[PDB]
């Protein structure tokens, strides 16, 4: 309990069904075909259908939802923009020129020796980086007036074809010469060397020595494409390119220089960046002197333990629903079975390991079976038992749980097991609903993304993946009606603001989602007057 528990206007029970989407196609639809009398009634009359995939949840367009992004967005009451989407918006809206950390790096060079370096994976792969981002960084660095800029090009061939690097190289040389007339290519080396993530420091050292000491094959703008073509003819592809060195000593990373890595994926940037900006140069075991007084920037955070500034640091995610309730001195209960326990804690609470004051947690063991189609009800009954006990106690004005079966059995692709998974989930929901009506809670049921509504591909084969269908949002309180947002479809970012509105609690400014309910009285005044 917490001091302000009695300030709530309505106690809310939020059920997050995992992998339960809304689809009218009955073919392979384990939810429609399953016996689901409870959800058939809850998903009738006053209910909503909200988006849980793609840009609606901060993911690239067309990408299916998932449990991590879904519980994050439900908990946060805002769209958390995934790195790719976030950076692409910045490029589209010319925001690099005013990026705080980019301006910082350019100010360091300008107030210092004038020298700045860009290093990363140069291709349109989009897994670790994108060449478009590197081009946008060059244009912004130029506009910001940095005296000297050098590019260290890491060859891909893994996220793109093994002989595409020559094209990205040609694109880059022409961009630097004709488009910007500013910036110089200094190194080409394959990601096998620059981007190791297995502590093979002898590979990092090849990239390190190329960048620091120009250890590699000397070439120039006129000759470098031909060098690469000769490498290709010798079966040395992009991923494995041995270093090519341009600009001589001036293009090396020297004392007092500043360096930006443009990859947004951290795992393969940790080693080279720590070699440059911390003490792991020792691990490279090189005879070359390490340059003094370097400053390293990353496109994103590579490790919290690193001193590096980031162009796009993590969303602060202040005042997610779980933090906000605690700040309002309202207690709460989060319950899941083992397979989804992280989702109702780490992910729901904002994507970090933090338990807020007044937050009580409950883990129900998942069944110990080889695969979950062998016990499709999983432990949904136990989760409902624990929620029902909290409803009877009345201690917590906000309680929430996850039901795992639809998602976890959905992944087995076994249609008949998925049907039973949904039947057991519906039974559990019904038991919670009856308890909320007995004990004075409002019930809201939603999901984190779809899965079980699509168990068959069109050819009749198994479908084991999440989906892009909408998810339900239900509400048992008859004093409210659902209303969609003005300018977009409702989405998972609208769940937490809606909870707060029903609970009669303030909404923090950090929640940029909107409540998608309206009190009937207020709707009635709006009708008769407008």
């Amino acid at each position: 309990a917490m001091a302000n528990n009695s300030s709530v206007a309505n106690k809310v029970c939020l059920i997050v069904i995992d992998g339960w989407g809304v689809s009218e196609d009955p073919y392979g639809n384990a939810i429609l075909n399953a016996q689901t009398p409870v959800m058939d009634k809850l998903c009738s009359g006053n209910w909503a259908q909200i988006e849980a995939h793609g840009l609606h949840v901060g993911l690239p367009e067309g990408l299916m939802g998932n449990s991590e992004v879904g519980h994050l967005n439900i908990g946060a009451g805002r769209v958390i923009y995934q790195d790719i989407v976030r950076i692409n918006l910045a490029v589209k809206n010319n925001k690099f020129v005013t990026n705080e950390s980019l301006v910082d790096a350019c100010d360091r060079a300008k107030n210092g020796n004038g020298r700045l370096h860009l290093a990363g994976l140069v291709s349109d792969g989009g897994v670790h980086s994108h060449i478009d981002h590197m081009f946008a960084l060059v244009k912004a660095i130029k506009e910001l007036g940095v005296p000297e800029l050098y590019l260290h090009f890491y060859g891909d061939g893994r996220d793109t074809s093994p002989n595409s690097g020559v094209g990205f190289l040609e694109q880059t040389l022409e961009f630097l010469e004709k488009t910007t007339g500013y910036g110089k290519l200094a190194t080409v080396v394959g990601r096998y060397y620059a981007m190791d993530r297995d502590n093979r420091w002898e590979r990092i050292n090849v990239a390190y020595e190329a960048m620091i000491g120009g250890v590699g094959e000397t070439s120039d703008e006129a000759g470098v494409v031909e060098v690469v073509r000769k490498r290709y003819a010798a079966d040395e592809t992009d991923e494995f390119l041995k270093p090519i060195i341009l600009q001589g000593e001036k293009g090396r990373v020297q004392n007092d220089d500043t360096i930006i890595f443009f990859d947004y994926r951290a795992d393969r940037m940790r080693e080279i960046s720590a070699a440059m900006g911390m003490d792991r140069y020792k691990d490279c075991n090189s005879k070359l002197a390490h340059p003094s007084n370097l400053q390293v920037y990353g496109m994103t955070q590579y490790k919290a333990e690193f001193p590096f500034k980031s162009l796009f640091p993590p969303a602060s995610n202040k005042n997610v629903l779980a933090e906000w309730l605690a700040e309002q001195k309202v207690s709460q209960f989060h319950c899941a079975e083992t397979e989804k326990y992280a989702h109702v804690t780490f992910f729901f609470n904002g994507g970090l390991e933090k338990q807020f004051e007044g937050e009580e947690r409950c883990l129900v063991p998942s069944p110990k079976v080889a695969t979950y189609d062998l016990q499709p009800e999983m432990s949904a009954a136990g989760v409902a038992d624990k929620m029902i006990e909290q409803l009877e106690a009345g201690t917590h004005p906000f309680i929430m749980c996850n039901f795992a079966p639809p998602d976890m059995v959905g992944h087995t692709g076994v249609y008949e097991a998925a049907v039973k998974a949904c039947e057991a989930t519906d039974i559990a929901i019904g038991r919670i609903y009856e308890a909320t009506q007995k004990h004075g809670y409002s019930l809201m049921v939603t999901a984190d993304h779809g899965n079980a509504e699509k168990m068959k591909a069109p050819d009749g084969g198994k479908h084991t993946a999440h989906t892009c269908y909408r998810v339900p949002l239900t509400l048992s309180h008859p004093g409210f009606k659902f209303v969609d947002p003005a300018d977009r479809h409702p989405a998972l970012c609208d769940v937490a603001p809606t909870v707060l509105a029903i609970m009669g609690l303030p909404q923090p400014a950090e929640m940029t989602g909107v409540s998608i309910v309206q009190k009937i009285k207020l709707a009635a005044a709006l009708e008769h007057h407008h």
């Binding site: 901060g58 995934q82 790195d83 947004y264 993590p314 994507g351």
Partner: peptide, 11 residues
């Protein structure tokens, strides 16, 4: 998994 919005959230 290291920060909200990182690459693992794509899956």
């Amino acid at each position: 998994x290291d920060y909200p919005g990182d690459y693992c959230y794509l899956y």
